[PDB]
Amino acid sequence: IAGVDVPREKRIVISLTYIYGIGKQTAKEVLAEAGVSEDTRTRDLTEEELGKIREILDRIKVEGDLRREVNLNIKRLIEIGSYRGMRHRRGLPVRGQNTKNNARTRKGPSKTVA
């Protein structure tokens, strides 16, 4: 519908949240400058009003655009031989978090108990 098929039972804000690159306040601003209320469900949208939603969303980076941008951002750090590139390659915390214990979102589930 709008880049992808957002849910049809929910409000417009919460459904728009399902697009990559749109959260909550960006959805509110979209529906604010799009001349559309936000308590109307997704089923009850018209064609012109949903078309204004489409027209509005073309000026924001969403889905593969952002994925390519962030992948290039990580790749540059990896390939200029920085510290953050080393951390990205080894799968260790990139910010200054401590790794003596308890860094599991990066290291995955607790590996082989030695």
Partner RNA sequence: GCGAAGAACCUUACCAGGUCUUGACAUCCUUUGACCACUCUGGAGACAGAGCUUUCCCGGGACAAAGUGACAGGUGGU
Partner RNA sequence: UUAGUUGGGCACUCUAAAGUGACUGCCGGUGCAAGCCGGAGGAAGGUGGGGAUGACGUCAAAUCAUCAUGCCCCUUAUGACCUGGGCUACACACGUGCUACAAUGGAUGGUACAAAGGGUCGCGAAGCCGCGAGGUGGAGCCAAUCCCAUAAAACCAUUCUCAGUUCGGAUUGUAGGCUGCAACUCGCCUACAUGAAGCCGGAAUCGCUAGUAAUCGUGGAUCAGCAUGCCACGGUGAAUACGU
The contact set with another protein (CB under 8 A) reads 76, 80-84, 86
| Residue 45 partner contact from another protein, Mg ion, RNA, none using kind-dependent CB cut-offs of 5 to 8 Å | none
How many residues belong to the chain? 114
**Out of another protein, RNA, Mg ion, none, which partner does residue 11 contact, by CB within 5 to 8 A per kind?**
RNA
Q: What count of Cα atoms within 13 Å lies in the side-chain half-sphere of residue 73?
A: 6
52 vs 84, which CB is nearer to RNA? 84
14 binds RNA, rule: CB under 7 A:
yes
CB within 8 A of 53, min separation 6: which ones?
2, 12, 16, 30, 31, 34, 36, 45
User: Smallest distance, Å, CB 33 to RNA?
Assistant: 14
Closest approach, Cβ 83 to another protein, in A, equals 5
